[PDB]
Design an enzyme around this catalytic site. Structure first.
Site, PDB file in Angstrom:
ATOM      1  N   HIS A 186      35.216  31.871  31.980  1.00  0.00           N
ATOM      2  CA  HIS A 186      36.625  32.434  31.915  1.00  0.00           C
ATOM      3  C   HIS A 186      37.171  32.293  30.483  1.00  0.00           C
ATOM      4  CE1 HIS A 186      35.468  31.715  36.205  1.00  0.00           C
ATOM      5  NE2 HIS A 186      36.461  32.615  36.466  1.00  0.00           N
ATOM      6  N   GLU A 192      36.024  37.970  53.071  1.00  0.00           N
ATOM      7  CA  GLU A 192      35.964  39.265  52.279  1.00  0.00           C
ATOM      8  C   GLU A 192      37.041  40.205  53.333  1.00  0.00           C
ATOM      9  OE1 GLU A 192      35.383  39.780  49.336  1.00  0.00           O
ATOM     10  OE2 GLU A 192      34.384  38.072  49.206  1.00  0.00           O
TER      11      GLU A 192
HETATM   12 ZN    ZN Z   1      37.343  36.714  47.491  1.00  0.00          ZN
END
Ligand code: ZN
Lengths: 186, 693
Positions: free
Chosen positions: B486, B356
């Site tokens: 998705h 992150e």
């Molecule tokens: Zn990511």
């Protein structure tokens, strides 16, 4: 009497950068001790003079130009700089003699919901002359023909600063007091 | 003033007004994620609506300035990013029906559930069906959840997806594209450059070319997993066939990482897990990110701003506030970077902190770019930067340097091979799935696959590209691809293929600049400032340059290359070849889990050829399916002395060739895993006339 520097830096009303206000300081003993010794200011860029030699010199007129800019716009309050603040809001001459004092006021001028009380000019026909003020909020057209917004190619020249307490230091409000000194070559 | 000067001042107006509305939209989104309630949803959607409405209204104003008039390339990139319309070209009737279809497709997927054989129980996808697919090792229970999800979500989503293709194709052709797949390939489209041009047709050429090189690695990995699945499921998987789709560790087979306990090379050796060594060093959530920050400052990247630490939610709040526990990196705008992570002292969250922060570093790099150019070079670049940070953070060299491992630590070849096998089940096992799924959608949008062959071609390519067989015959009433999140959410899926390829192109290039001697999977770019400087060349570009040029800055070539990916798993390919000496390498599309008990049916066309009176194509085939059930239903009651409600659902038809032949078999209701032996079925058939010999 004592020069009221506390009435300039501690004033509760700082005007916008395009509508910057100037106060004349004269006929008072110049005591700058509160400035350099205190670490309140984030910038103390003096031009044409030394901060330590301010006490030695005397017999001058002081102009205090107060306004609020963004954190990243303090770079443009140096003589010879280019940007929307130098070109269209506040320009310093290349032979500027004085000191530029800025300090972060995120606690004062920034709010959780956004403080939009401060505006800057980003559209203009030509750059400002040194120490010249343009406070006309007339619609701007790139060709120059007047028009009434909303329309195409017709925009207002003033846009508000969006000041929040969560933005980075480059986008946080800064109060800038520009001090101009009457030189010995009067 | 010329059109470039008029577009220049329009961008100045947009950039200021976009900055505030984008910041307000992201600021409203953060408050909802950090405090979930009913009031925050209203503010989150209201702020999002203002930004969307402003961007859409400002998008048409940008099209007033033609791109050809703009000489400057920086302005040309910004208008080109802003002049994209999408669904705007559609009429009000069509643009509103599409939103109805898109929302209904998400609603069906979100509210999808199956009712267990225990009647008074509903099983949702999370965590009910995901637990069965990820954790359960029972063939019958996995086929129940796998087939149940297809039969419930897929069948309902089938009519909506057919209309979704038609409406999205009309939108793409209106924007001058050939099909909606061509519209999706425009995320890799560079046209204004010289020698850096990437066509939409070049993407499919490169995706297909790179996959041809991963196939030898995937076949060796497919063969090893197939042999290990024969130990876990004896007699239910062919030694030389494909893999049943419900035994791949999750609902869709996207990742094979949940097959690791079954396919672990050396189960006696434990994994290199430092979660319990962090608990013994009084590590906290802030400590994890503080150590992650020092990794980026080692390679020369900037440290996190002081605003980041105060603003970010680096742990689950103590007070009773509902929060989203999905780790994300936030670039709200105005120099405000945040990470929202329900951090635990475990090692898995320790690697997530480096992933992150690899996004925040990317966002911090291009924060000086123009507002429209503040994003990754393409959709695969942002998720590749974060992944390469976890590769260096999981290295035992990095862990020993942090004190999480003893200095005299032996990295045995057994443990290293276990690591590469763990990586392959996640990184290599997804590449054929990603390629095959997006290839199916590309051909469906292109019209190459007729809607009567959507399922015929879906499982034909599954058995040929992925080497995976359907456990049960799905016949044109299912939409198996739509069962994935998705596909039903109208999200392009090729970004997960290019990101994997870019991930090891960046990693191999950065490891080379770090002067790493040895295998690529033991590389740590930590303390190498030159690797960070080479990385920053790509990072600070943002969208300002074509992704081919951005790729060339860090990698040195402007083309997708999979050899760096094959270099990462070179030690595993050597070990896989040694293990598969006595095992079959490759799969045969002939075998199916139901083929052995399947009974072929031969249709004798007794009617006159070429007669309009009799159209025996598709309307008569369902009668036999509902008729064969009666014969078995009566047979069980008379012979087995047990009554079972056999129906048309229980009879399954496969390899249906209209007017010629079709293979069929029958299963007990709610027990599709166990199929009735053909001898008992033929015993019922032998009771009546013998049609087939
Ligand atoms: Zn990511």
């Amino acid at each position: 009497n004592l020069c009221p520097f506390g009435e300039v830096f501690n004033a509760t009303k700082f005007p916008s950068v395009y509508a910057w206000e100037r106060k004349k300081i004269s006929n008072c003993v110049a005591d700058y001790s509160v400035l350099y010794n205190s670490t309140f200011f984030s910038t103390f860029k003096c031009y044409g003079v030394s901060a330590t030699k301010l006490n030695d010199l005397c017999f001058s007129n002081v102009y205090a130009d107060s306004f609020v800019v963004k954190g990243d716009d303090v770079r443009q309050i140096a003589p010879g700089q280019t940007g929307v603040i130098a070109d269209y809001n506040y320009k310093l001459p290349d032979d500027f003699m004085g000191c530029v004092l800025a300090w972060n006021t995120r606690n004062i001028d920034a709010t959780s919901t956004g403080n939009y009380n401060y505006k800057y000019r980003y559209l203009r026909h030509g750059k400002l002359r040194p120490f010249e003020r343009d406070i006309s909020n007339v619609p701007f057209s790139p060709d120059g023909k007047p028009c009434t917004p909303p329309a195409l190619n017709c925009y207002w020249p003033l846009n508000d600063y969006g000041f929040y307490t969560t933005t980075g230091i480059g986008y946080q409000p800064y109060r800038v007091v520009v001090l101009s000194f009457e030189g010995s070559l009067e | 003033s010329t059109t470039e000067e008029q577009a220049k001042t329009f961008l100045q107006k947009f950039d200021h007004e976009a900055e505030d509305l984008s910041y307000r939209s992201s600021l409203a989104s953060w408050n909802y994620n950090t405090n979930i309630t009913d009031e925050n949803v209203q503010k989150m959607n209201a702020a999002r609506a203002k930004w969307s409405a402003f961007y859409e209204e400002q998008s048409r104003i940008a099209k007033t300035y033609p791109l050809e008039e703009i000489q400057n390339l920086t302005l040309k990139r910004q208008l080109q990013a802003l002049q994209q319309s999408g669904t705007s070209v559609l009429s009000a009737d069509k643009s509103k029906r599409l939103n109805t279809i898109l929302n209904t497709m998400s609603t069906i997927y979100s509210s999808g559930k199956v009712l267990d054989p225990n009647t008074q129980e509903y099983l949702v996808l999370e965590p009910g069906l995901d637990d069965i697919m990820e954790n359960s090792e029972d063939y019958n229970r996995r086929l129940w959840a796998w087939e149940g999800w297809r039969a419930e979500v897929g069948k309902q989503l089938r009519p909506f997806y057919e209309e979704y293709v038609v409406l999205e194709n009309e939108m793409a052709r209106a924007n001058n594209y050939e099909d909606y797949g061509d519209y999706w390939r425009g995320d890799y489209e560079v046209t204004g450059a010289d020698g850096y041009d990437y066509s939409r047709n070049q993407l499919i050429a490169d995706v297909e070319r790179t996959f041809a090189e991963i196939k030898p690695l995937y076949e060796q990995l497919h063969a090893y997993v197939r042999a290990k699945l024969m130990d876990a499921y004896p007699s239910r998987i062919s030694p030389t066939g494909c893999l049943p789709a419900h035994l791949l560790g999750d609902m869709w087979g996207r990742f094979w990482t949940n097959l690791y306990p079954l396919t672990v090379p050396f189960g006696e050796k434990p994994s290199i897990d430092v979660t319990k060594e962090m608990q013994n060093q009084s590590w906290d959530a802030k400590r994890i990110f503080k150590e992650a920050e020092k990794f980026f400052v080692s390679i020369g990247l900037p440290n996190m701003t002081q605003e980041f630490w105060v603003n970010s939610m680096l742990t689950e709040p103590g007070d009773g506030r509902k929060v989203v526990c999905h780790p994300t990196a936030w670039d709200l705008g105005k120099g405000d970077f945040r990470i929202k992570m329900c951090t635990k002292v475990t090692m898995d969250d320790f690697l997530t902190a480096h992933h992150e922060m690899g996004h925040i570093q990317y966002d911090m790099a291009y924060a000086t770019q123009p507002f429209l150019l503040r994003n990754g070079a393409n959709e695969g670049f942002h998720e590749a930067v974060g992944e390469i940070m976890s590769l260096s953070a999981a290295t035992p060299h990095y862990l020993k340097a942090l004190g999480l491992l003893p200095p005299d630590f032996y990295e045995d070849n057994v443990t290293e091979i276990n690591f590469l096998l763990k990586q392959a089940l996640q990184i290599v096992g997804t590449l054929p799935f990603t390629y095959m799924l997006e290839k199916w959608r590309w051909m469906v949008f292109k019209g190459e696959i007729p809607k009567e062959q959507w399922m015929q071609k879906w499982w034909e390519m599954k058995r040929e590209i992925v080497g995976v067989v359907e456990p049960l015959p799905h016949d044109e009433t299912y939409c198996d691809p739509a069962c994935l999140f998705h596909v039903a959410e109208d999200y392009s899926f090729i970004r997960y293929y290019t990101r994997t390829i870019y991930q090891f192109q960046f990693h191999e290039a950065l490891c080379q600049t770090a002067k790493h001697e040895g295998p690529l999977y033991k590389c740590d770019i930590s303390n190498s400032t030159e690797a960070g400087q080479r990385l920053l060349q790509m990072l600070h570009l943002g969208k300002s340059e074509p992704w081919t040029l951005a790729l060339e800055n860090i990698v040195g070539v402007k083309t997708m290359d999979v050899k760096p990916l094959l270099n990462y798993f070179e030690p595993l390919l050597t070990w896989l070849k040694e293990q598969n000496r006595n095992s079959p390498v490759g799969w045969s599309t002939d075998w199916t889990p139901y083929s052995d008990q399947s009974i072929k049916v031969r249709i004798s066309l007794k009617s006159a050829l070429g007669e309009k009176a009799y159209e025996w194509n598709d309307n008569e085939m369902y009668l036999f399916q509902s008729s064969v059930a009666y014969a078995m239903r009566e047979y069980f009651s008379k012979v087995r002395n047990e009554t079972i409600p056999f129906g048309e659902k229980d009879v399954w038809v496969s390899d249906l060739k209209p007017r010629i032949s079709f293979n069929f078999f029958v299963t007990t209701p709610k027990n599709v895993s166990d199929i009735i032996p053909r001898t008992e079925v033929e015993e019922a058939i032998r009771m009546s006339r013998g049609r087939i010999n």
